[PDB]
């Protein structure tokens, strides 16, 4: 077999729309390197091509829906790491103040393309904030992510 459940796959379908700028269902080296560096890095095209070739079926320089999923489906379906929480935190919070509040979170969601509500973000944070101080720290995040 080579696939994931509606939940696990949920992130994959969505992710695909995050990588590709037009979300046509395929990401090329042009968009790859663009969104890649957009996060906070300055890699090379070489990685984009090589990495992509490792994911694309026809190896034309762009990954497809099943090609991206199948690759990540054959292995590693559900899991996390202390790094995902740190990197994540950096992806969520722009200034990375080691503490994200529902407000800033809402600003982030809508900043990327998500309309979150005050009650939604507030409930999302308070539910992830073990200390309930209005923000989320490392441990609070790592646990709320996997070690709930």
């Amino acid at each position: 077999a080579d696939q994931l459940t509606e939940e696990q796959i949920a992130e994959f379908k969505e992710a695909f729309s995050l990588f590709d700028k037009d979300g046509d269902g395929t990401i090329t080296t042009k968009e790859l390197g663009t969104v890649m560096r957009s996060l906070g890095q300055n890699p090379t095209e070489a990685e984009l091509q090589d990495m992509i070739n490792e994911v694309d079926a026809d190896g034309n320089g762009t990954i497809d829906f099943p090609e991206f999923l199948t690759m990540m489906a054959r292995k590693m379906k559900d899991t996390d790491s202390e790094e995902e929480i740190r990197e994540a935190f950096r992806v969520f919070d722009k200034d990375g103040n080691g503490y994200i509040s529902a407000a800033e979170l809402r600003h982030v969601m809508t900043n990327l393309g998500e309309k979150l509500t005050d009650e939604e973000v507030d409930e999302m944070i308070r539910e992830a904030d073990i200390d309930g101080d209005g923000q989320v720290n490392y441990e609070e995040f790592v646990q709320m992510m996997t070690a709930k």
């Binding site: 994959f12 992710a15 984009l48 996390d80 992806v91």
Partner: peptide, 28 residues
């Protein structure tokens, strides 16, 4: 930083998998 896979790709894989977890599948 994967071991022998796709950095940018896998990077996105984890990032998305993380946010999505807090996006909806958080307190399910």
């Amino acid at each position: 930083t994967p071991r022998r896979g796709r950095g940018g790709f896998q990077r996105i894989v984890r990032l998305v998998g993380v946010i999505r977890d807090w996006a909806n599948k958080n307190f399910r």
